[PDB]
Design a protein around this ligand. Structure first.
Ligand SMILES: C[S@@+](CC[C@H](N)C(=O)[O-])C[C@H]1O[C@@H](n2cnc3c(N)ncnc32)[C@H](O)[C@@H]1O
Ligand SMILES: C[S@@+](CC[C@H](N)C(=O)[O-])C[C@H]1O[C@@H](n2cnc3c(N)ncnc32)[C@H](O)[C@@H]1O
Ligand SMILES: CNc1cc(C)nc(Nc2ccc(OC)c(C3=CCNCCC3)c2)n1
Ligand SMILES: CNc1cc(C)nc(Nc2ccc(OC)c(C3=CCNCCC3)c2)n1
Ligand SMILES: [Zn+2]
Ligand SMILES: [Zn+2]
Ligand SMILES: [Zn+2]
Ligand SMILES: [Zn+2]
Ligand SMILES: [Zn+2]
Ligand SMILES: [Zn+2]
Ligand SMILES: [Zn+2]
Ligand SMILES: [Zn+2]
Lengths: 273, 269
């Protein structure tokens, strides 16, 4: 039987509480980590926070025009009037998003500040059947809605390379130079509990807000389709993760489209010869 | 004969709107600065944002216990149940206040997060009689209430020493400064009073880089509606600006007026 174990795993560090339940086994509100709502550093990253380096807009409306420079650096501004991704949004090739910032002319409440406004939808940390902890929606979520940000600790590839647990890494794809990661292992928000789905229902988008240091995009998940209450959430972890993790365990998403089940895995070894 | 010029000079960045009114002359909503709710940088200040260098507490309560480490770092926690300073607060030389942080065990709603929770009282930017713009209250403000932070651009004393205008400099105790000239919030418009109803306090929140305390204003006594806010700018400012102009605070205790500046000029010779 199900029961509210933690009333709010975010200790009210979010716009809404995110409670945790377990109706599958006897594991408690996990506490092998620290909840944070915003990214953190351990080493010196020296994010460029130079207010003059900020590409801003001069809009004096609600930034709903196409003349918003902030909403040009991403071709179009990709948010509708209700702060959803355009139905025509490039869901496979997600461009960089530059939200309005503190150098802009617009008001804090313009139409180009979705991600920076924090979680809005009601989420729940819950015990899955076969994947441990997972996240699910306690409400329908229209396609294109912002769910939550992938928050954790900022580290270099050289740091990631030598960390015991690689279970909670997230790659920040940068065109040039050195590469960086978010490790949600020791520090993280709700999103650290999102599982991999072979048939995903959210997508990550690299976003820029209070700063535009291309080394460190913030990662925001939006719903790639309508989501029915109670439905588990999950993005595609991609092959990097699976190539490493397969020999240790097997996908359990269950989707017939499953590309990483013990069955589909062995089918390709069988297809080999 | 008073007009409302900006609905909110903070462009909706504060918890509340801060409107501007002019009942004196024909000067409009000031617009030769950028309004920001949080301190900004131009050049790198290399603040220490390392979460492990954060001294945290491990309370499970609302941090009311005398056992909250954060509280102790400040001698004790100086906030009452409603977030106001204690009547027994050192108003002359106030201690640094370490608020709870993101590494603390406590909840975001604990008793030790006043300043980080933003402006609560209703303020208004208005045109004074002889002091240009000023900030006044729209409500009574109980003593020890948190008002606003002095927000601006962090600069070294080397940088400050060669800034054209030194009118929006606020000093921290390596020397660094907040210059609210090109970037600032409502506090950039608080005038100087010889009878100051607010005091600065150095605070730490998301980080504990001691070079960079954030500056919070609290009422030093009760404040009636309409009453103008103002803090003693200190003698550094006046020993510079005296020869340029003189204090118009209007106080009977005023110590920088034309009268006073001449009274001590001759009270000597
Ligand atoms: C970032 S964590 C997600 C939260 C995790 N379920 C937990 O309870 O901590 C990812 C780890 O959860 C498990 N996991 C996530 N998605 C899975 C999936 N689709 N199938 C099987 N295990 C999965 C694996 O142990 C994986 O290394
Ligand atoms: C930090 S600004 C205060 C905002 C200023 N009233 C304005 O209109 O922008 C400080 C400047 O305001 C004026 N000022 C502030 N306090 C004053 C006082 N007590 N008497 C006269 N002028 C004052 C002087 O021009 C001073 O250099
Ligand atoms: C270990 N060193 C590095 C270095 C870099 C640049 N990226 C990564 N990324 C990485 C590696 C392994 C992973 O799983 C085994 C993952 C993922 C972890 C779970 N979160 C979803 C993304 C895949 C990411 N790791
Ligand atoms: C110009 N260079 C420097 C360097 C340093 C370390 N401090 C300062 N502080 C300073 C100088 C002049 C001031 O007024 C003329 C002020 C003040 C400005 C207005 N705000 C009230 C505090 C006094 C501060 N200035
Ligand atoms: Zn705009
Ligand atoms: Zn903008
Ligand atoms: Zn905008
Ligand atoms: Zn699968
Ligand atoms: Zn505490
Ligand atoms: Zn604390
Ligand atoms: Zn606390
Ligand atoms: Zn005076």
């Amino acid at each position: 039987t199900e029961k509210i174990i933690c009333r709010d795993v975010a200790r009210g560090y979010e716009n809404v509480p995110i409670p945790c339940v377990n109706g599958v086994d006897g594991e408690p509100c996990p506490e092998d980590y620290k909840y944070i709502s915003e990214n953190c550093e351990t080493s010196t990253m020296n994010i460029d926070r130079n207010i003059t380096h900020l590409q801003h807009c001069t809009c004096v409306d609600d930034c709903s025009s196409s003349n918003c420079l902030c909403g040009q650096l991403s071709i179009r501004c990709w948010y509708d009037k209700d702060g959803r991704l355009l139905q025509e949004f490039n869901k496979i090739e997600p461009p960089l998003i530059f939200e309005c910032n503190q150098a802009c002319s617009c008001w804090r409440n313009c139409k180009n500040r979705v991600v920076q406004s924090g979680i809005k939808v009601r989420l729940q940390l819950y015990r899955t059947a076969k994947m441990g902890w997972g996240v699910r929606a306690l409400q329908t979520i229209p396609q294109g809605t912002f769910i939550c940000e992938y928050v954790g600790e900022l580290i270099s590839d050289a740091e990631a390379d030598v960390r015991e647990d690689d279970s909670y890494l997230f790659d920040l794809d940068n065109k040039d130079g050195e590469v960086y990661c978010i490790d949600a292992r020791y520090y993280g928000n709700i999103s650290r509990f999102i599982n991999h789905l072979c048939d995903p229902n959210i997508i990550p988008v690299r976003v820029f807000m209070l700063h535009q240091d291309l080394r460190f995009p913030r990662i925001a998940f939006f719903s790639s389709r309508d989501i029915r209450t109670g439905e588990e959430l999950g993005f595609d972890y991609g092959d990097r993760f699976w190539d490493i993790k397969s020999k240790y365990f097997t996908c359990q998403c269950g989707s017939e489209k499953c590309k990483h089940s013990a069955e589909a895995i062995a089918l390709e070894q069988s297809r080999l010869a």
